[PDB]
Design a protein around this ligand. Sequence first.
Ligand SMILES: [Mg+2]
Ligand SMILES: [Mg+2]
Ligand SMILES: [Mg+2]
Ligand SMILES: [Mg+2]
Ligand SMILES: [Mg+2]
Ligand SMILES: [Mg+2]
Ligand SMILES: [Mg+2]
Ligand SMILES: [Mg+2]
Ligand SMILES: [Mg+2]
Ligand SMILES: [Mg+2]
Ligand SMILES: [Mg+2]
Ligand SMILES: [Mg+2]
Ligand SMILES: [Mg+2]
Ligand SMILES: [Mg+2]
Ligand SMILES: [Mg+2]
Ligand SMILES: [Mg+2]
Ligand SMILES: [Mg+2]
Ligand SMILES: [Mg+2]
Ligand SMILES: [Mg+2]
Ligand SMILES: [Mg+2]
Lengths: 52, 110, 95, 110, 151, 162, 23, 288
Amino acid sequence: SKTILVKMMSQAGTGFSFNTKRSRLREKLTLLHYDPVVKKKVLFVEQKKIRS
Amino acid sequence: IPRPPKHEHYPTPSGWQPPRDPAPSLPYFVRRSRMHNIPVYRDITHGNRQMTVIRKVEGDIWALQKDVEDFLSPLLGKTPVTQVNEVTGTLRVKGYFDQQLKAWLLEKGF
Amino acid sequence: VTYFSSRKGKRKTVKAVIYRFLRLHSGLWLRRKAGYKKKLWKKTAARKRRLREFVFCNKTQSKLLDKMTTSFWKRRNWYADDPYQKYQDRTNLKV
Amino acid sequence: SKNLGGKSPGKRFGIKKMEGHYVHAGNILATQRHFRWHPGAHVGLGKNKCLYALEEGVVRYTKEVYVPNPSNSEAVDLVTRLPQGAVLYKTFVHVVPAKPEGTFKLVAML
Amino acid sequence: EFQSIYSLDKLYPESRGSDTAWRLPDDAKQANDIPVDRLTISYCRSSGKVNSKAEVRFHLASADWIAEPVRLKLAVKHKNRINRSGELILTSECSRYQFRNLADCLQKLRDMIAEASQPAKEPSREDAELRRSRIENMNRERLRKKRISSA
Amino acid sequence: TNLDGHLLEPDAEYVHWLVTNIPGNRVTEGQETCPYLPPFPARGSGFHRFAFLLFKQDKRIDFSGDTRPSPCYQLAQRTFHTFDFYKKHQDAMTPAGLAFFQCRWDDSVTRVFHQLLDMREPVFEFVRPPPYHPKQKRFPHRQPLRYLDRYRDSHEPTYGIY
Amino acid sequence: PVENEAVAPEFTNRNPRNLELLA
Amino acid sequence: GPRALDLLRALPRVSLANLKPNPGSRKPERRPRGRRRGRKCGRGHKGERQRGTRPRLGFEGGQTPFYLRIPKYGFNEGHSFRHQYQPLSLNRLQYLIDLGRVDPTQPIDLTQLVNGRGVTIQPSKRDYGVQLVEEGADTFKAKVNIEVQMASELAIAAIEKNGGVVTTAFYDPRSLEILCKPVPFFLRGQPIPKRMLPPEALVPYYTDAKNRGYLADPARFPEARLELARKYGYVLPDITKDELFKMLSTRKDPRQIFFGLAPGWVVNMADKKILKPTDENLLKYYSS
RNA sequence: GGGGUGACCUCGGAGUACAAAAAACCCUCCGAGUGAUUUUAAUCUAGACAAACCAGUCAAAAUAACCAUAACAUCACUUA
RNA sequence: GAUAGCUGGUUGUCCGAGAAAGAAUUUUAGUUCAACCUUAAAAAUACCCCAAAAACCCUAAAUUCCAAUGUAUUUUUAAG
Ligand SMILES: [Mg+2]
Ligand SMILES: [Mg+2]
Ligand SMILES: [Mg+2]
Ligand SMILES: [Mg+2]
Ligand SMILES: [Mg+2]
Ligand SMILES: [Mg+2]
Ligand SMILES: [Mg+2]
Ligand SMILES: [Mg+2]
Ligand SMILES: [Mg+2]
Ligand SMILES: [Mg+2]
Ligand SMILES: [Mg+2]
Ligand SMILES: [Mg+2]
Ligand SMILES: [Mg+2]
Ligand SMILES: [Mg+2]
Ligand SMILES: [Mg+2]
Ligand SMILES: [Mg+2]
Ligand SMILES: [Mg+2]
Ligand SMILES: [Mg+2]
Ligand SMILES: [Mg+2]
Ligand SMILES: [Mg+2]
């Protein structure tokens, strides 16, 4: 059960990405994170994959 | 170094003040510096030893030492520690008393 | 450290210390925390803030850096809009 | 040979401030692996079971009754399994504040 | 007497005389607000923190450089800083320079004058500090609601 | 009696309305020793306590020492000590009624201070003790850069000789 | 000066409910 | 007074045979000789320390050193290209004027300050002139025509309140050396060069009226002066009605270094002469 | 407990090390080099633990968004 | 005048104080920090320390922190 490291960018337009661990057998990750640029609860979608 | 101009009111806005015209009757004279300032400096040694140096003294330096101890005793409640370099004409008080000694010498007219 | 150079006979300085350190005029040395850019996804926000925070050096490391630097780096610098100009001096140090 | 990994330093888990020590706000009173000392008045609880002072005062150590949280299932079960005369007691650490909250100073007599 | 291509006269031909930078354009500002000559300014240098408190006193009722509704709004809102002799008093202690302290007092006076001169003021109040007072007023009127004639 | 509000003495209290020798329930018929004075709590120090104490007595108590004048606007004369008052009148008086309330500053206390008391309104403030900082070290090991700001006297650049 | 103008800047409020009401 | 001179009468002649330094001025050197200071002579037993082969300073015995484990960060990055400005407090300026080192009756410049020993400019250390601070703005009572490179709003206001003139000019390193030490430049044998313009990083500072830039529009100076006066609560004095208005309003050409001199002149100080160029190309190059 | 062969090299828990802390052996035993789930868990700053240094740990107040009453992510001996 | 963490040697007198090892390290034949110690300088508390206080199944010698008291020592600063 190997994990994956994915970088997710904000959807509020401002450039803000954060990396998180995810399961390989899972679909594209989409969460609700906190963006300090707009200071709001913003939807974050999986953009890139960094580490296995 | 140009001599200081004569002003209509003393002390000057920068706090400077010339000596009195006649010399006081004290058995010692604290000669002004080459920049017409009072030769009362502060010194630091070993990073924690703070002293105050009175330089350019001509005359009975022991009388000046006695006057300095009598002036600094009521401020500290005890006789301050002093060193008298007679061959140099220098007083060295243990502590930072530069501003107070400058004001005292100004009141004494030096 | 080259205590006596071969061309001028002067004392040289190591460039690593000037590349990764900052000397305030009061004698203190400022540095960055080691590892503040490595594996930020694995660390807690508090640990990340601790790593991002600047830090000072102790007396032995400060004396070592003073020995490794020349007198050109221990001068008084009056920079235009210097952030550390307020920290260049020391106040209320009752030693 | 067969036994490996037994080398590990001590975590310095102990009591920092004893009874009677005048502490300040934020001072860690005691660190622990398991709950040995429980926080009382003006004593916070870190996520590592460490105890720090929330006010500036004198540290005290008392033996006091233990009423657990009604959500902590293990503790509630132990409580309901205790006999009719049993009362759980624990060692609590408190900080008795010495400085007052503030004073009323006259700022302007208009 | 020397001149060059980058001289001020050749750079800005609109102003060529040497006295154009030293004029007093009184026509630009004819309102003449804050007549500092009519204000009582005092300085108290407290050292030992070192700070120079600046105190600006002026009679509000005798202040004729402001309109009557503005003066009434000042006397209503800022009555907490009005002396019993009618002298409105402002105080500054931020900076160690009496220049900056006086500037702060004058800016406070400007803000007060503007707030009392603009008619679009809605008088907005906070909530974190006002909810307690609101609940206390409600709980005291719950007892005050007794209706019995007396006196 | 006003328990909090005496500016000079902490252990003393103020009088606001003292009326003795009440026949039965008719309070207006009894002679008022101290005329009524409105509450005047300071602006800063708020929430003073004002207590109405009702004592039942046996004899017709007469006293010339506790009497107040008709204006009675002097704070030195309006200084009470209920302990000494009850020690003086302990033979006949016995407390039977009590009603106390809280009172803070409002827009009428300035009027009471200026017109009645002939004073300037004193304004107080709830100040807090200064924050504690350890003894400043020569070489603060591994401390943030803001360590030097905790011991700064003023946030103003000071050029010594320059 | 005015005999009533004595202030004693250290004002002591012995009311145990004072700070509780002031929050 | 000096009783030592009277004491010297009874003492014998002072010669080279009786001369002693001050007690404590000469700590005697000690050599590895004898029972105490011999026998390994303060070096210790075997190893690297007695044989003089211990490693360098930053070395810690193979462990990754402290001066190499800390990550590189920009602290002195580009330090040799940061413009430096020696601070001059209004307190120090008033001290100089009151002691007579500089005269308020003449336009005060960097040359006058270095002559009065008020500031020391090291142009080889990337110093770009003198900046004005306001440490003594409360007790400043001098009316001077000051010429600095940078100034603070408070210092400018404190000077205007007395009724002076503040101006921020620019000097590239060569012109700064020439302005600080003019006599060593006049003894060099070279014509006075032109004053280079400030770079793009400093152009918005010197073309601004709030900073009293020497390249700023002189039409916006009274407006900025009135704004400063109405902000700091002081009446702006009528500067044009002063008896020294010419000295207060005297200016330097943005290509000019000294007062009265011109780019291209050779000052022959031996014969007290000023050689001026007459060639058309020389004049065009020196006036461009 | 000479080297060679064999074994080990970093981190955590228990005993040695009985009650503040620390404490070694090629001493006796367990383990780790991660999984699962959603509450996706911020900025700034007093004061402290621990420590040769590098590193590791807590944390009051103040700030933006959610109940207008919590936010220390939880569990797997949680310590690694 | 290669280089040696390795061996050997290292030249007058007297006086003062005076050190047996915790951590890293191709490191355990060596170095660099810490803890001790030397030389100066600033200070004020320093050891001894009765109560009281320091965990839960059983647990000894005794420890930690503290008044008083008996002494004068201790902590920081600069060189090491
Ligand atoms: Mg010196
Ligand atoms: Mg173990
Ligand atoms: Mg170990
Ligand atoms: Mg030697
Ligand atoms: Mg030698
Ligand atoms: Mg020897
Ligand atoms: Mg021998
Ligand atoms: Mg040996
Ligand atoms: Mg050896
Ligand atoms: Mg040997
Ligand atoms: Mg290695
Ligand atoms: Mg310089
Ligand atoms: Mg063997
Ligand atoms: Mg093998
Ligand atoms: Mg510790
Ligand atoms: Mg909080
Ligand atoms: Mg050799
Ligand atoms: Mg070796
Ligand atoms: Mg005991
Ligand atoms: Mg003790």
